[PDB]
């Protein structure tokens, strides 16, 4: 239960509304017990008085109490729910946005530790599970504790033995039964949290892989795995249902015992008189009514094992410290960028071999560099070091003769343009897929950059307003390839990193793109990763990598004459 | 909102409950037994209370009524325990069967139709919206009989005692259902927009999570927090709108419940004193009559307050059914599931006659296609990017709908059984994905019981075994989310190992050697060239100089095949291929 402390500390926000809901929950209960307690005594007092005692009996005041308690019961409960549910879902809104804000700082390596469908389960489903903590643990428990004391103290004036017999049963139930239901349901609650997030991960993975699973006949055996998780999840759901049913049955028997004891015990005497008379109905109808205050009490702790399990999931995600940290100092973005690497080494998390081993290159401002190498030789790992995806181990990287780790994050993103090897098409509109880079661009600039990159057919019909991605239109592989080039051309950064930008493009389209890049990327430092040794004459320097090292480095003409690894790439 | 649509969703919801019809009737019977036992309990307390208070009977003389009162209490706790478990069991059987229907259709839908929603919105549809139907089946359906029979049985027990008390309860009931229907007319639409905002918030989150790398590249952290804040704020406001309707209806029904309890208490209290004389059968109003009506007054409205509470569970299921019913209605790739199948495992022949390939939204992807690929022959698709080359391969996989003719061995593709057709299919796709946990589980996707010799042959041919020593666990190394453990060219060769592991009647290759350098493209193409000769093959590629032995070359432009023939004829004859080859 120590994991709920950070989330009970969100009561400080909206503390006036959350404490107002507690007060109105107490007042609602007091009026609810009083309505049935006054009617039980009023009927018995009136019956005993009879016609003869009409003038001696003050019947107007009880008639006002039952009327007054009727509105207070219905008005209090309505308003208690309004204020408590309003504040609760404002707390859950802030908790959700706060939990989402932790993801991008963890993006390259921290997010790889989790599955994407489980991360989705935490931010939407596990945050929503914590509504139990703000709606139905604090208000029911302190509402029932105050009402029991008010009932016990109030009845103590009439008789001490009867008050503590009813009060003792209620107080013993309040302090002994909910902890019993917490232990009986915490293991189920942990499974219930685990199995819902495992089902959502398996379902999203199963859905996002249906192109491959269907063709290779693995959909059924991956649906069987998913359908087995639902069997376990439904079994845990049924286990919690039996606990609720047992809780309700037991609450009916404890309340029965209080009524039975009050009937038997108060009959002998109430306050020392042989014939209590109407005071018997006072205690019997108090026991019959006061046990409505303990109804939500047992379920407050029974569902806490699932709330604690969820709160651990959110806390784990928000307690992650990002591996890469940026200075808060404000820096000016330079118009010319020349980067320097001296013996850069990098090892991936949970790995033994180095992806980069002593990479060293000096790229002057305005130079265009082509990087060549085998598959899996660290070409993409190099371009991601330059983006501060990871901090290098036993190396140093400098931009304009200043360390790359000393740049403000806003300045680092304004000085580097990247075309990733895998292009993500977001599920927004076409305009928003291009407003990632240069948010202030107009539709005239967005439309023109699409014409240059060859995506003019994408401007037809809805055009910029057309919805792209999931729930909309997929672009082809080439159209995605050209959409990423359009993004990087809009960013307009001094340093441009291109990871195989002309990939999956036909010969004519590639020529048009390479012609466009050559024009737009003038007086820009460009590191272009290619698997195609075409138009390498233009590049002022060619880098050939192998197993995370720069094997040979020189101009296109020099690399052919010496007939190194590059020459074999060209012809062979 | 439309009431006609809502009336159609309630019919669909009510049909799913037939499987649990026995359990729903048992809870109706058990809920009536609870009404009987609460009348008996109120009668025993009133008889005991009347004897002690008015006749001063010692508690020892009253032992049979205590014995029966305790017995009634024990029986009532047993029925409540039974009824909760019966109702839950009915609800999850219906939920399990509804989710099976949804997942059954998602299998037949394929990747093209799964594209219709963000993957996070599919999860809301399957998890949140099917699970929120429970209280409709478990609670609301049994309650309709209990909302009529239980209050009626309460009243019948009070006419023989006091006819004025039974009219106070019946005088307040008729406004209960009118106010129930008045508050809840907009509850089904408020729930529909609540699930709409939850699916939008869930689909938006998983989309930005999968593109978190592109967001970090461009520094969209502040912008994406606001986009979540907007989607989260909308969901919070739709949730509130659902809740204030359930609080208002609950409060209004509590007002009448409390008004009647006060009215019964005041009527009997004044009747005992003699303030008013009506309401009794020429006999003094006994104290047992007052206690019986007082205990049973809250229980007269319980079945009616529960019906109002479960009327909003019904509205929650109707708003949850709106999105499910739409999915279960939209036609799939082919209107009728094919039953025909082809027996021979020999390479198939493909014929297309005025073939049109369209999206799920009806937009044509490839124009009139007329070609023929004889059995065992291999064809090459080349052309400009965005000319619909990949759409033809997706239509051959059975993923897209087509309007013309597309015959496999003379049998229309839509008439083929999709599961049996896919056993004669193998392909490497554009930007391939690795769904299995490890590298070995991915290569063995086609059949996980392959021999170690067959597995090693695929890894050797696909040039995968060269980077195996780099991986820590070797072939058992997990690949991670979207194969994050592998480089792009390494995941490309793992997808080539899938295609080359089982024999097939037709092999499709979208971009088999993508993201491979000059040398590794040669070794991978050595395996794919030999594999393309073993059966009918349709490869899409941008490489042109490398291919000269392929039987026929198809060039598309704007979704239409415009040249056919071998490399020798097309290279020197001009046209678009020579222009394509010129660069
Ligand atoms: N997340 C990761 N964890 C561990 N190792 C990784 C990870 N991503 C890549 N690697 C490994 O790092 C090495 C270099 O990977 P990198 O992505 O830099 O290759 P690359 O040269 O870009 O390849 P390609 O040309 O195929 O795109 C390979 O052994 C690769 O499998
Ligand atoms: Mg790479």
Coordinates of C-alpha atoms in Angstrom, one line a residue, chain A residues 28 32 35-36 39-54 57 59-60 63 66-67 69-71 73-75 77-78 81-82 85-86 89-90 92-93 96-97 100-101 103-104 107-108 111-112 114-117 119-121 123-125 128 196 199-201 203-223 226-227 230-231 233-238 241-242 244-246 248-250 252-253 255-256 259-260 263-269 275 277-278 280-281 284-285 288 350-351 353 373-376 380 384 387-389 409 413 416-418 420-428 435-437 439 457 467-474 476-482 484 487-488 491 500 503-509 511-512 531-534 547 568-570 572, chain B residues 41 45 48-49 52-54 56 58-60 62-63 66 69-70 72-74 76-78 80-81 84-85 88-89 92 95-96 99-107 110-111 114-120 122-124 126-128 131 139 198 200-222 224-225 228-229 232-233 235-236 239-240 243-244 246-248 250-252 254-255 257-259 261-262 264-266 268-275 287 290-291 294-295 298 305 361 363 383-386 390 397-399 419 422-423 425-428 430-437 441 444-448 463 466 469-472 480-493 495 498-499 511 513-520 522 542-544 558 579-581 583:
Chain A
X28 CA -25.9 12.1 3.2
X32 CA -30.2 8.5 5.5
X35 CA -34.8 9.2 8.0
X36 CA -35.4 5.6 8.8
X39 CA -39.7 6.9 11.3
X40 CA -39.2 3.8 13.4
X41 CA -39.3 5.8 16.6
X42 CA -42.0 8.2 15.5
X43 CA -44.4 5.4 14.6
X44 CA -43.8 3.6 17.9
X45 CA -44.0 6.8 20.0
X46 CA -47.2 7.8 18.3
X47 CA -48.7 4.3 18.6
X48 CA -47.9 4.1 22.3
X49 CA -49.2 7.6 23.0
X50 CA -52.4 6.8 21.2
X51 CA -55.4 9.1 20.9
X52 CA -55.3 10.0 24.6
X53 CA -51.8 11.3 24.4
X54 CA -52.4 13.5 21.3
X57 CA -47.2 14.4 22.2
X59 CA -45.7 15.3 16.7
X60 CA -44.9 18.3 14.6
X63 CA -42.8 15.3 11.0
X66 CA -38.4 13.1 8.4
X67 CA -39.3 15.7 5.8
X69 CA -34.0 14.2 6.2
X70 CA -35.7 13.3 2.9
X71 CA -34.3 16.3 0.9
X73 CA -30.6 12.4 1.7
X74 CA -31.4 13.0 -2.0
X75 CA -29.7 16.4 -2.3
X77 CA -25.9 12.2 -2.4
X78 CA -26.4 13.9 -5.8
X81 CA -21.2 12.5 -6.5
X82 CA -20.8 15.7 -8.6
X85 CA -16.4 12.6 -9.7
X86 CA -15.5 16.0 -11.1
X89 CA -11.3 12.7 -13.3
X90 CA -9.4 16.0 -13.3
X92 CA -6.7 11.3 -13.7
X93 CA -6.4 13.7 -16.6
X96 CA -2.3 10.7 -17.8
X97 CA -0.7 13.7 -19.4
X100 CA 2.7 10.5 -21.3
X101 CA 5.4 13.3 -20.9
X103 CA 8.0 8.8 -22.9
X104 CA 9.8 11.0 -25.4
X107 CA 12.3 7.2 -26.6
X108 CA 15.4 5.5 -28.1
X111 CA 11.0 2.7 -24.4
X112 CA 12.7 -0.5 -25.8
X114 CA 8.7 -2.1 -22.6
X115 CA 6.2 -3.5 -25.1
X116 CA 4.1 -1.0 -26.9
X117 CA 0.7 -2.5 -26.1
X119 CA 2.7 1.0 -22.5
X120 CA -0.7 1.8 -24.0
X121 CA -2.4 -0.2 -21.2
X123 CA -1.5 5.4 -19.9
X124 CA -5.2 4.8 -20.6
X125 CA -6.3 1.7 -18.7
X128 CA -8.3 4.8 -15.2
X196 CA -5.5 -7.1 -19.1
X199 CA -4.2 -9.2 -23.5
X200 CA -3.8 -5.7 -24.9
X201 CA -0.2 -6.3 -25.9
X203 CA -4.0 -8.1 -29.4
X204 CA -2.1 -5.1 -30.7
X205 CA 0.8 -7.2 -31.8
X206 CA -1.6 -9.7 -33.4
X207 CA -3.4 -6.9 -35.2
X208 CA -0.3 -5.1 -36.4
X209 CA 1.2 -8.4 -37.8
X210 CA -1.8 -9.7 -39.7
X211 CA -0.2 -9.3 -43.1
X212 CA 2.5 -11.8 -42.1
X213 CA 0.5 -13.9 -39.7
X214 CA -2.3 -14.5 -42.3
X215 CA 0.0 -15.6 -45.1
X216 CA 2.2 -17.9 -43.1
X217 CA -0.7 -19.4 -41.3
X218 CA 0.3 -18.2 -37.9
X219 CA -2.9 -16.2 -37.2
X220 CA -4.8 -19.1 -35.6
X221 CA -2.0 -20.1 -33.3
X222 CA -1.4 -16.5 -32.3
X223 CA -5.1 -16.1 -31.7
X226 CA -4.5 -14.4 -27.3
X227 CA -7.7 -16.5 -26.5
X230 CA -8.6 -14.1 -22.2
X231 CA -9.5 -17.4 -20.4
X233 CA -8.3 -12.9 -17.6
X234 CA -11.9 -14.0 -17.4
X235 CA -11.1 -16.5 -14.6
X236 CA -9.5 -13.7 -12.5
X237 CA -12.6 -11.6 -13.3
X238 CA -14.8 -14.4 -12.0
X241 CA -17.0 -11.6 -8.7
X242 CA -17.2 -14.4 -6.2
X244 CA -18.0 -9.4 -4.2
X245 CA -20.9 -11.9 -3.9
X246 CA -19.4 -13.3 -0.6
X248 CA -22.5 -8.9 0.0
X249 CA -23.8 -12.1 1.7
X250 CA -21.6 -11.5 4.8
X252 CA -26.4 -9.1 5.1
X253 CA -25.6 -11.6 7.9
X255 CA -26.5 -6.5 9.7
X256 CA -29.0 -9.3 10.4
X259 CA -31.0 -6.3 14.2
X260 CA -31.5 -9.7 15.9
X263 CA -34.5 -6.8 19.1
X264 CA -33.5 -9.3 21.8
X265 CA -31.3 -7.1 23.9
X266 CA -33.3 -3.9 23.9
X267 CA -36.4 -5.8 24.9
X268 CA -35.1 -6.4 28.3
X269 CA -34.5 -2.8 29.0
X275 CA -40.5 -1.6 29.5
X277 CA -41.7 1.0 24.8
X278 CA -40.9 3.1 21.7
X280 CA -37.0 -0.6 21.2
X281 CA -37.9 0.6 17.7
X284 CA -33.9 -1.9 16.0
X285 CA -34.4 0.7 13.2
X288 CA -31.6 -1.8 10.2
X350 CA 22.6 -5.6 -22.5
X351 CA 25.3 -6.3 -25.2
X353 CA 30.3 -6.2 -28.5
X373 CA 29.3 -0.2 -45.6
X374 CA 27.8 -3.6 -45.1
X375 CA 24.4 -4.3 -43.6
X376 CA 24.7 -4.1 -39.8
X380 CA 22.5 3.9 -38.6
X384 CA 21.9 8.3 -34.1
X387 CA 21.3 13.0 -32.8
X388 CA 22.1 12.4 -29.1
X389 CA 20.0 9.3 -29.1
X409 CA 17.6 20.4 -26.7
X413 CA 16.8 19.8 -33.0
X416 CA 20.1 18.7 -37.4
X417 CA 17.7 17.3 -40.1
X418 CA 17.3 13.6 -40.3
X420 CA 15.4 8.0 -40.9
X421 CA 15.8 4.6 -42.6
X422 CA 12.3 3.6 -41.4
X423 CA 9.7 6.4 -42.1
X424 CA 6.7 6.6 -39.8
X425 CA 3.4 7.9 -41.2
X426 CA 1.5 9.4 -38.4
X427 CA -2.3 9.1 -38.1
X428 CA -2.9 12.8 -38.6
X435 CA 4.1 20.4 -39.7
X436 CA 6.4 18.2 -37.6
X437 CA 9.2 20.2 -39.3
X439 CA 5.5 24.3 -37.7
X457 CA -0.9 13.6 -56.7
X467 CA -6.2 12.1 -43.4
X468 CA -3.1 9.9 -43.5
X469 CA -1.9 6.9 -41.6
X470 CA -4.1 4.4 -39.7
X471 CA -7.7 5.2 -40.2
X472 CA -6.8 7.0 -43.4
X473 CA -4.6 6.6 -46.5
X474 CA -1.4 4.6 -46.5
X476 CA 3.3 3.5 -50.8
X477 CA 6.9 2.7 -49.8
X478 CA 8.2 5.3 -52.3
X479 CA 5.6 7.9 -51.2
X480 CA 6.6 7.4 -47.6
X481 CA 10.2 7.7 -48.7
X482 CA 9.5 11.1 -50.3
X484 CA 10.4 12.0 -45.1
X487 CA 9.9 16.7 -43.8
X488 CA 13.7 17.3 -43.8
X491 CA 13.2 21.7 -41.3
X500 CA 19.4 5.7 -47.4
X503 CA 15.5 3.6 -50.9
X504 CA 12.8 1.8 -52.8
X505 CA 12.6 4.5 -55.5
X506 CA 12.8 3.8 -59.2
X507 CA 15.7 5.0 -61.3
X508 CA 13.9 8.1 -62.6
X509 CA 12.4 9.1 -59.3
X511 CA 17.4 10.9 -60.1
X512 CA 14.8 13.6 -59.5
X531 CA 23.8 1.4 -50.4
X532 CA 24.0 2.8 -53.9
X533 CA 27.4 3.9 -55.3
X534 CA 25.8 6.4 -57.8
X547 CA 32.0 -3.8 -38.2
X568 CA 34.7 -4.0 -55.0
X569 CA 31.4 -2.3 -54.2
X570 CA 31.5 -0.4 -57.6
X572 CA 32.2 -7.0 -58.6
Chain B
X41 CA -38.7 -10.6 7.1
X45 CA -40.0 -7.9 12.6
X48 CA -42.2 -9.0 17.1
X49 CA -42.0 -5.3 17.5
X52 CA -43.1 -6.1 22.7
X53 CA -43.9 -2.4 22.3
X54 CA -47.7 -2.5 22.5
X56 CA -45.4 -6.0 26.4
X58 CA -41.6 -10.9 27.1
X59 CA -38.9 -11.7 24.6
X60 CA -38.8 -15.3 25.9
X62 CA -41.5 -14.8 21.4
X63 CA -39.2 -17.5 20.2
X66 CA -37.2 -14.9 16.2
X69 CA -36.7 -14.2 11.4
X70 CA -33.2 -15.5 11.6
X72 CA -35.4 -15.6 6.7
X73 CA -32.2 -13.6 7.1
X74 CA -29.9 -16.6 6.4
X76 CA -31.9 -14.0 2.0
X77 CA -28.1 -13.9 2.2
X78 CA -27.9 -17.2 0.4
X80 CA -28.1 -12.7 -2.8
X81 CA -24.9 -14.7 -3.0
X84 CA -24.8 -12.3 -8.0
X85 CA -22.8 -15.4 -9.2
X88 CA -22.0 -12.7 -13.6
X89 CA -21.8 -16.1 -15.2
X92 CA -19.2 -13.2 -19.3
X95 CA -19.0 -11.2 -23.5
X96 CA -16.8 -14.1 -24.5
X99 CA -15.5 -11.0 -28.5
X100 CA -15.1 -14.2 -30.4
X101 CA -17.4 -12.9 -33.2
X102 CA -15.3 -9.7 -33.4
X103 CA -12.0 -11.5 -33.5
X104 CA -13.4 -13.9 -36.1
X105 CA -14.1 -11.0 -38.4
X106 CA -10.8 -9.3 -37.7
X107 CA -9.1 -12.5 -39.0
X110 CA -6.9 -8.7 -43.2
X111 CA -4.4 -5.9 -43.1
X114 CA -7.4 -3.4 -40.0
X115 CA -6.1 -0.2 -41.5
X116 CA -9.5 1.3 -41.1
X117 CA -8.8 2.1 -37.4
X118 CA -5.7 3.0 -35.4
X119 CA -4.5 -0.1 -33.6
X120 CA -5.2 1.6 -30.3
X122 CA -9.2 -1.5 -32.1
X123 CA -8.1 -2.3 -28.6
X124 CA -10.7 0.0 -27.1
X126 CA -12.3 -5.2 -28.2
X127 CA -11.5 -4.6 -24.6
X128 CA -13.3 -1.5 -23.2
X131 CA -16.5 -5.4 -21.3
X139 CA -28.0 -6.7 -14.4
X198 CA -11.6 6.9 -25.7
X200 CA -9.5 8.4 -30.3
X201 CA -7.3 8.9 -27.2
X202 CA -6.1 5.3 -27.3
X203 CA -5.4 5.3 -31.1
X204 CA -3.6 8.7 -30.8
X205 CA -1.4 7.5 -28.0
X206 CA -0.2 4.3 -29.7
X207 CA 0.3 6.1 -33.0
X208 CA 2.6 8.7 -31.4
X209 CA 4.3 6.0 -29.3
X210 CA 5.2 4.1 -32.5
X211 CA 6.4 7.3 -34.0
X212 CA 8.2 8.4 -30.9
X213 CA 11.5 8.4 -32.7
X214 CA 10.3 10.8 -35.4
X215 CA 8.9 13.1 -32.6
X216 CA 12.3 13.1 -30.9
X217 CA 14.1 13.9 -34.1
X218 CA 12.0 17.0 -34.7
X219 CA 11.6 18.1 -31.1
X220 CA 7.8 17.6 -31.0
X221 CA 7.7 16.9 -27.3
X222 CA 5.8 20.1 -26.3
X224 CA 2.6 16.2 -28.7
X225 CA 1.8 16.8 -25.0
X228 CA -2.6 14.4 -25.8
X229 CA -4.0 17.1 -23.5
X232 CA -7.5 13.6 -22.8
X233 CA -9.6 16.7 -22.1
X235 CA -12.4 12.1 -23.0
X236 CA -12.8 13.7 -19.5
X239 CA -17.1 10.9 -19.2
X240 CA -18.6 13.7 -17.1
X243 CA -21.9 10.6 -15.3
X244 CA -24.2 13.7 -14.7
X246 CA -26.6 8.8 -14.1
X247 CA -26.4 11.0 -11.1
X248 CA -29.5 13.0 -12.1
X250 CA -30.3 8.3 -9.5
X251 CA -31.1 11.5 -7.5
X252 CA -34.6 11.9 -9.0
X254 CA -34.2 8.8 -4.7
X255 CA -36.4 11.9 -4.2
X257 CA -38.2 7.0 -2.6
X258 CA -37.6 9.4 0.3
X259 CA -40.8 11.3 -0.3
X261 CA -41.0 7.0 3.2
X262 CA -41.7 10.3 4.8
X264 CA -45.8 6.6 5.0
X265 CA -44.1 7.7 8.3
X266 CA -46.3 10.8 8.6
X268 CA -49.1 6.3 10.1
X269 CA -47.8 8.6 12.8
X270 CA -50.8 10.9 12.5
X271 CA -53.2 8.0 12.1
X272 CA -52.1 6.5 15.4
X273 CA -52.7 9.8 17.2
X274 CA -56.1 10.2 15.6
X275 CA -55.3 13.2 13.4
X287 CA -48.4 -0.9 15.2
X290 CA -47.1 0.7 10.4
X291 CA -43.8 -1.2 10.8
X294 CA -42.2 1.3 6.9
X295 CA -39.7 -1.5 6.4
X298 CA -37.6 1.4 0.8
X305 CA -34.1 2.4 -8.3
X361 CA -12.7 3.0 -49.3
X363 CA -10.4 4.2 -54.5
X383 CA 7.7 1.0 -63.0
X384 CA 7.6 4.4 -61.3
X385 CA 7.0 4.7 -57.6
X386 CA 3.3 5.1 -56.8
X390 CA 2.4 -3.3 -54.6
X397 CA -2.5 -12.3 -51.3
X398 CA -6.3 -11.9 -50.9
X399 CA -6.0 -8.6 -49.0
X419 CA -7.0 -20.2 -45.5
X422 CA -2.6 -18.9 -48.2
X423 CA -0.9 -22.3 -47.8
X425 CA 1.4 -18.5 -50.9
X426 CA 4.8 -17.2 -49.8
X427 CA 6.1 -13.6 -49.9
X428 CA 8.6 -11.0 -48.7
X430 CA 7.7 -4.0 -48.5
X431 CA 9.0 -2.9 -45.1
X432 CA 8.5 -6.5 -43.7
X433 CA 7.6 -7.0 -40.1
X434 CA 8.7 -9.7 -37.6
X435 CA 5.8 -10.6 -35.3
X436 CA 7.3 -13.5 -33.5
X437 CA 9.4 -13.1 -30.3
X441 CA 10.5 -18.1 -34.0
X444 CA 10.0 -20.7 -38.4
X445 CA 6.7 -18.8 -38.7
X446 CA 5.5 -20.9 -41.7
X447 CA 6.0 -24.1 -39.7
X448 CA 7.6 -24.0 -36.2
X463 CA 22.5 -14.7 -45.7
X466 CA 26.7 -14.2 -41.1
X469 CA 27.5 -14.5 -33.9
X470 CA 26.9 -10.8 -33.3
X471 CA 23.6 -11.6 -31.5
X472 CA 24.0 -12.6 -27.9
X480 CA 12.1 -6.5 -29.8
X481 CA 9.4 -4.1 -30.8
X482 CA 9.4 -3.7 -34.6
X483 CA 12.6 -5.7 -34.7
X484 CA 14.5 -2.9 -32.9
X485 CA 17.3 -5.4 -32.0
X486 CA 18.1 -5.8 -35.7
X487 CA 19.2 -3.4 -38.3
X488 CA 16.9 -2.7 -41.3
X489 CA 19.0 -4.9 -43.6
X490 CA 19.2 -7.7 -41.0
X491 CA 15.4 -7.8 -40.5
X492 CA 15.1 -7.8 -44.3
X493 CA 17.1 -11.0 -44.6
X495 CA 12.0 -12.0 -43.7
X498 CA 10.5 -17.0 -43.9
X499 CA 9.7 -17.0 -47.6
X511 CA 11.2 -5.5 -52.5
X513 CA 16.6 -7.1 -51.4
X514 CA 15.7 -3.7 -50.0
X515 CA 18.2 -1.9 -47.7
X516 CA 21.0 -4.3 -48.7
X517 CA 24.4 -3.2 -49.9
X518 CA 25.8 -4.2 -53.3
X519 CA 27.4 -7.5 -52.1
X520 CA 24.7 -8.8 -49.7
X522 CA 24.0 -10.4 -54.6
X542 CA 13.8 -1.4 -59.0
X543 CA 16.9 -3.3 -60.0
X544 CA 16.9 -3.6 -63.9
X558 CA -0.7 4.8 -63.5
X579 CA 13.8 5.2 -70.4
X580 CA 13.6 3.5 -67.0
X581 CA 16.8 1.6 -67.7
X583 CA 19.0 6.3 -65.6

